Amino acid sequence: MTRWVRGIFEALRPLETLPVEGLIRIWAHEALRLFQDRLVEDEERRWTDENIDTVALKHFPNIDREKAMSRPILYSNWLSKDYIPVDQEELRDYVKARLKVFYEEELDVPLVLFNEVLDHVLRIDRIFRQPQGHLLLIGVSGAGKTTLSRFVAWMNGLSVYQIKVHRKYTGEDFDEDLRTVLRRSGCKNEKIAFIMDESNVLDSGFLERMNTLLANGEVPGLFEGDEYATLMTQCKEGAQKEGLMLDSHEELYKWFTSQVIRNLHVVFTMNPSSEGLKDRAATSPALFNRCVLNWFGDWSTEALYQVGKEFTSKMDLEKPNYIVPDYMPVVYDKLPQPPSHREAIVNSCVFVHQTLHQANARLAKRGGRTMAITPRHYLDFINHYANLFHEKRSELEEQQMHLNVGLRKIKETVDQVEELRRDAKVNRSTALLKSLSAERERWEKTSETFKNQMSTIAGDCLLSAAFIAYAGYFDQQMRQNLFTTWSHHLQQANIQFRTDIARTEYLSNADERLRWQASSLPADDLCTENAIMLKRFNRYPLIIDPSGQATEFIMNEYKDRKITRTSFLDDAFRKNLESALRFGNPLLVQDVESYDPVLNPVLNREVRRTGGRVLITLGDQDIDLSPSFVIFLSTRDPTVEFPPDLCSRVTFVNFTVTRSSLQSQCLNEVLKAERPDVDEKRSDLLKLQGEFQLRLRQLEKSLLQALNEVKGRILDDDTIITTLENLKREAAEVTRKVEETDIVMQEVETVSQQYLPLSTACSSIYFTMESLKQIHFLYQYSLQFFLDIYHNVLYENPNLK
Amino acid sequence: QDLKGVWSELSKVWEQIDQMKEQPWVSVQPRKLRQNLDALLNQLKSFPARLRQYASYEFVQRLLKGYMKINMLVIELKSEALKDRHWKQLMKRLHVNWVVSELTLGQIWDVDLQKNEAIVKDVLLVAQGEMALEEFLKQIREVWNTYELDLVNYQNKCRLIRGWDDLFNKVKEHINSVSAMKLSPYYKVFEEDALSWEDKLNRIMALFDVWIDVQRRWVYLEG
Ligand SMILES: Nc1ncnc2c1ncn2[C@@H]1O[C@H](COP(=O)(O)OP(=O)(O)O)[C@@H](O)[C@H]1O
């Protein structure tokens, strides 16, 4: 309440004539900025918002509550001066202009201005423009804490200064940094926005000094001895600059204290944790008394929708053929009606994010292990969506151009063979002409198929990106459930995507899978999908595996690139990091449960491109970065819990075997070793999604290359038609496969259903053996043991003979 | 007429383009270049639509738009990573003959940077790798010319050396980094310096490994 009074007085000082409505407006704005600022969930926020206006009307009748209490309550001194109330849109335009200028200065990564960012920018600016105006920020990682803090600090002229924590970060290092920042703030009269994350706040040794600095205004005893003498010596020059001649040591120390209090604002960024925040309160009260705290958690639906709209403006997503379905599935209430195709795609992206929230909450209710889902994952998802869309569109355009070139070449050769007929050979020439006409009609059909794929590309890429970015930590069954939910949603929205889409085939090709199988990567479907995850990533992948096949596979894959192994526990880890960070080689890292926060700059991909040099701030040391640097984090323990900070900077790759993964693996092995015809038909069905088509296109390219050697010699026997009969029978075979695909699907489904109980028995038996370790410590069994038993049953079985 | 007016405006725009291109590349500022490009674009947009429909105006507008989109490549090339060896190398690949002292933005704008984007980006990455290695060599030199032995008095009888652990960690860090630096093919440049530094580091390693044992035995037998 005393800060309430101070805020009202500060707002009323430059103004001289105010009706009662203005006073009530200022009072309500201060109530919003002091009480509802610190709340966590939506119900309490609504309670506070309604009670403020209820109290205002109860204790102040006869006034017009509309002007006095307006829902978009906002105050700023940027528009004109004197802390005048401002409408949201004018401030939006001003922030857009200043953010553009900021872009030309620093942090070229774009920002999307939804209402929440505007409010938080206003709050941070209000807190900064205040002596000893320290700030606490509580919110989920990636919500825009450090970015907005730095933006507001730069806007108000505050020079940001953030310490980089690492392993063996002794207290003396923080003492030296504190001395440096205090000298920079007080002595040189340079205002500082000092930003601290939670990684360095974990140790309680630093928090006591920071508590003293917060409360007293400057921690006593940080300067002592010759360093204290240098402090006073430079403080004399500081007083020289300001014309405040003083000679006694204590009085100039007090002047340094005043300068520090007036010119140092410290912003804390802390992840939401009830027990963690309780411990912080236990070790320090001034973090809640001296520091005013602002809560902003997960982005609202409007924020997600606006970010998706702004980050999908570059892509086409414009289908004039798209219609509006009846009962459009809307997760954003402010969608245009009727919506455009891009509108529907962004709505589907928002729905994907929200349904992953719902799935995570349900799995938490069930009692399993859950990983945090943050808006940084949403940005990663939208980046994967853009990249896959562009890549697939470029491939389709190149393939269509190749087909057009082939068609023109065939037309020219038809004209040439007509000219050569102008002059048994004639019958062969007629056969060649008919054959070329048939192949031309086939390429027209191929062009129609190209149009169909160009239609389905948008939804297919959306689902593929949603899988590659969001999922990865859940087991096979949960991945399938999420993919089915996304497919059903896109089916509701009339967004065209292939109904039998296969994730493994559309995100890779034959050569990559063959190379993976060359390394120690088993043909299990989970392993292939997670190899897909490992090939494409924006955030560095974190692999979890109780078996350790991941490490061998990933070292074999990158063995040609001088990959190295390193653990966190090894004291040379920083050592190895620096090497891999400058000489340009991948470095797989193990035992991530003992995570070292020193990797935070690397995972964040924050680099500084200055002086003809790219620099990474590895701890307190700046290191040259090489473009060929991919880092993989690994762990053998599969039940370990990760902090939300780590969970929001890496994509999880799960290799744990569950009741659904082993079931599918054993069913596939049964089909392969017992019904080879059914397994062959299933493989043909799976390869029909491009692989056969890719072979056909490669073969027609080979025909193009052979026909380019024509020179009249194409009529050696006047039938080069044998090669195109090979093509024609191959095309007839693939056409037959496509026509009868439904019958193949049905037969494979029936055979797999018949063989399923054996797979369920296999999974249950293996998990019973695995959980026998609780009966006695001697009963320890491995998955390879069960696979040996299973092979001894399937092969070398006398009874089956 | 209107054609004469648009021809005069085109001549003025071309004169402005030539004047900004006469600035030598040594004295060109990428940020100011981008600002001037934006100003020229704004000036072009101020022309009437009748003058804007002319083919020559469209050609100049698209040329300046190409300059705008390659401004990022100009910024990347305007590093110190380029040295002159990479400039010589790109000269050899692009088969152009320039003078480093007489180098200005004009000749390189005549060269299609967009068409040669792959080569330019390869040159940039090569330059960044070589600068990483050279900066590492500068760092090792400056730490190993400024490192001092931590001498401490002993019983008023001698002045022994402490801090063996930190010095040994530094030596092993540097020897392993240099040994791993043989890979990363960019090592083909600055190889004799690397070999000399490795030899010096190995000499330090052996000398101080013997030194620590001598000091320990001597202090024990002294006691
Ligand atoms: N309004 C926004 N529009 C677009 N991107 C944003 C916005 N806010 C934050 N981001 C992105 O999300 C990230 C948020 O990081 P931040 O939350 O500051 O890290 P930390 O969780 O350590 O505080 C930034 O890298 C930024 O690129």
User: What's the token pair of residue A684?
Assistant: 């043909």
CA distances (Å), A767 to each of A80, A474, A661, A662, in order?
70, 18, 12, 10
- In this complex, the residue of B80, B131, B184 whose CB is nearest that of residue A584 is B184
Non-local (6+) Cβ contacts of B179 within 8 A are B198
CA A740 centroid distance within chain: 40
Distance A178 CA to ligand 1 centre (A): 27
Q: Which amino acid is present at B34?
A: R
Strands A192-196 and A608-610, sheet pairing: unpaired
CA distance linking residue A735 with residue A733, whole number of Å? 5
Q: What angle do CA A467, A469, A473 make, to 5 degrees?
A: 80
Q: At what angle do helices A204-216 and A171-182 cross, to 10 degrees?
A: 20
Q: What is the DSSP string of A420-474?
A: HHH--HHHHHHHHHHHHHHHHHHHHHHHHHHHHHHHHHHHHHHHHHHHHHT-SSS
Show contacts of A226-233: CB within 8 Å, 24+ apart: A227/A179, A231/A183, A231/A187, A231/A256
Residue A343: other Cβ atoms inside 10 A = 20
DSSP sequence for A538-585? SSPEEEE-SS-HHHHHHHHHTGGGT-EEEESSSTTHHHHHHHHHHS--
Backbone angles phi, psi at A219, to 5 degrees: -75, 125
Q: B57-67: buried (b, 16+ CB within 10 Å) or exposed (e) per residue?
A: beebbeebeeb
**DSSP 8-state secondary structure symbol assigned to residue A36:** G
Total Cβ atoms within 10 A of residue A147? 14
Q: In A575-659, where do the E strands start and end?
A: 587-590, 608-610, 613-618, 621-624, 631-635, 651-654
Residue window 617-676, chain A: list those with CB within 8 Å of chain B. 624-627
Residue among A301, A285, A357 at smallest CA distance from A334:
A301
Burial label, A255 (beta-carbon count in 10 A; 0-12, 13-18, 19+): middle
The 3-state secondary structure of A712-740 reads: CHHHCCCCCHHHHHHHHHHHHHHHHHHHC
C-alpha to C-alpha distance for A691 and A18, rounded to whole angstroms: 75
Give the tokens for residue A27: 């009072």
Q: Which run of H or of E encompasses A156?
A: none
Which residues touch A201 (CB under 8 Å, ≥6 apart)? A207, A268, A270, A280
- CA A640 – CA A638 distance, rounded (Å): 6
CB A342 within 8 A of CB A310: no
Place of tokens 């690139």: A561
C-alpha separations of A57 from A25, A36, A50, A421, A696 in Å: 12, 18, 11, 98, 76
Q: Which atom of ligand 1 is nearest to the CA of A311?
A: 4
B147 SS3 class: coil
- Give the helix/strand (H/E) hosting A270: strand A265-270
3-class DSSP state for residue A67?
helix
- A141 near A645, Cβ under 8 Å? yes
Helices B85-94 & B117-146, crossing angle to 10 degrees? 170
Query: To which residue do tokens 């169909």 refer?
Result: A452
Q: Compute how many other C-beta atoms are within 10 angstroms of the C-beta atom of residue A681.
A: 20
Residues within 6 Å of ligand 1 by CB: A 109-112, 117, 141-147, 197, 269, 307, 376, 379
Experiment type? cryo-EM
Return all residues near A441 (Cβ < 8 A) that are at least 6 apart.
Answer: none
Structural contact between residues A542 and A652, judged by C-beta atoms closer than 8 angstroms: yes
A144 is in an annotated binding site: yes
Residue A91 sits at the vertex; the CA angle it makes with A89 and A96, to the nearest 5 degrees, is 95
> CB neighbours of A635 closer than 8 A, spacing ≥ 6?
A542, A543, A544, A545, A590, A591, A592, A593
Q: What number of other Cβ atoms are within 10 A of residue A291's Cβ?
A: 19
Measured CA to CA, the distance from residue A68 to residue A54 in angstroms comes to 12
d(CA A743, CA A721): 33
Question: Residue A379 C-alpha to ligand 1 middle, in angstroms?
Answer: 9
User: Which DSSP symbol is given to B155?
Assistant: T
A150: CB partners within 8 A, 6+ apart? A107, A160, A193, A195
Edge to edge, the sheet with strand A651-654 lists A564-567, A587-590, A631-635, A541-544, A651-654
Q: Specify which residues A632 forms β-bridges with.
A: A588
Give me B19's structure tokens.
């004047």
Helix (H, G, I), strand (E, B) or coil at B181: coil
Chain B: residue nearest A586 by CA?
A: B184
Burial of B142 (0-12, 13-18, 19+ CB in 10 A): exposed
Report the residue among A147, A164, A269, A381 best suited for mutation to probe ligand 1: largest number of ligand atoms under 8 A from its CB.
Answer: A147
| DSSP output for A280-330 | HHHH-SHHHHTSEEEE--SPPHHHHHHHHHHHSSSS----TT----SS---
Residue B156 DSSP SS3? coil
Q: Are A389 and A457 in contact (CB under 8 A)?
A: yes
Per the structure block, which two tokens stand in for B52?
């804007």
Contact state of B129 with A578 under an 8 Å Cβ cutoff:
no
Q: Residue written as tokens 């947009």?
A: B45
**Coil/strand/helix, residue A536:** coil
What is the Cα–Cα distance from A129 to B202, expressed in whole angstroms? Answer: 57
How far is the C-alpha of A342 from the C-alpha of A322, rounded, in Å? Answer: 10
- CB-CB neighbours of B141 under 10 Å: 12
Q: Which residues of A fall within a CB distance of 8 Å from B180?
A: 579, 583, 585
Q: What is the DSSP letter of A130?
A: S
List the one residue out of A207, A220, A295, A288 whose CA is nearest residue A250. Answer: A220
Can you read off the two tokens belonging to residue B74? 């100009």
Gap from CA of A114 to ligand 1 centroid (Å): 13
- Which residues on A lie below 8 Å from B186 (Cβ)? 584
Residues A377 and A374: their CA atoms lie apart, in Å, by 5
C-alpha count within 13 angstroms, C-beta hemisphere, residue A408: 5
Contact B128 A627 (CB under 8 A): yes
Q: Can you give the three-state secondary structure of A177-197, one letter per residue? A: HHHHHHHHHHHCCCCEEEEEC
Could you say which of A579, A584, A613 has the minimum Cβ distance to residue B135?
Answer: A613
Other C-beta atoms lying within 10 Å of the C-beta of residue B194: 19
Q: State the CB neighbour count (10 A cutoff) for residue A143.
A: 27
Angstrom distance (rounded) from CA B15 to CA A130: 53
Element (H, E) at B158: strand B158-161
Chain centroid to CA A207: how far?
32
- Please state, in angstroms and rounded to a whole number, the distance separating the CA atoms of residues A148 and A109: 12
The phi and psi torsions of A624 (rounded to 5 degrees) equal -65, 140
**Ligand 1 atom nearest to CA at A141:** 21
What is the edge-to-edge ordering of all strands in the sheet holding A613-618?
Answer: A608-610, A613-618, A621-624
Interface contact A608, partner B, CB < 8 A: no
In the sheet that A159-162 helps form, which strands lie side by side, from edge to edge? A159-162, A192-196, A265-270, A135-138, A292-295
Resolution of this structure in Å: 3.6
For Cα atoms A370, A374, A375, give the angle at the middle one, nearest 5 degrees. Answer: 155
Tokens representing residue A131 in the block: 């002596």
The enclosing H or E element of A131 equals: none
Is residue B56 less than 8 Å (CB to CB) from chain A? no
Rounded to an integer, what distance in angstroms lies between the CA atom of residue A390 and that of residue A386? 6
Which residues, in sequence order, are CB contacts of A271 under 8 Å at separation 6+? A138, A139, A140, A141, A198, A643, A644, A645
| CA end-to-end span of chain A | 88
Tell me the C-alpha distance between B31 and B37, whole Å: 10
- For residue A401, the one-letter residue type is M
User: How far is A553 from A783, CA to CA, in rounded Å?
Assistant: 18
**A147 CA distance to ligand 1 middle (Å):** 5
How far is residue A723's CA from residue A729's CA, in Å, rounded to a whole number? 10
**B192-222 helix and B164-180 helix, angle to the nearest 10 degrees:** 160
Asked if residue A477 lies in contact with residue A437, where contact means CB atoms within 8 angstroms, the answer is no
Task: Name, in order, each residue with C-beta under 8 angstroms of A96's C-beta and a sequence gap of 6 or more.
Answer: A113
CB atoms A613 and B81 under 8 Å: yes
Cα–chain center distance at A151: 22
Q: Kindly state the tokens that stand for A329.
A: 């599935």
CA distance A120 to A111: 13
Asked if A611 reaches chain B (Cβ–Cβ under 8 Å), the answer is yes
Strands A541-544 and A292-295, how do they pair? unpaired
Contact yes or no for A588/A554 (Cβ under 8 A): yes
Q: How many residues does chain B have?
A: 223
* Chain-centre distance for alpha carbon B102: 21
Give the three-state DSSP class for B164.
helix
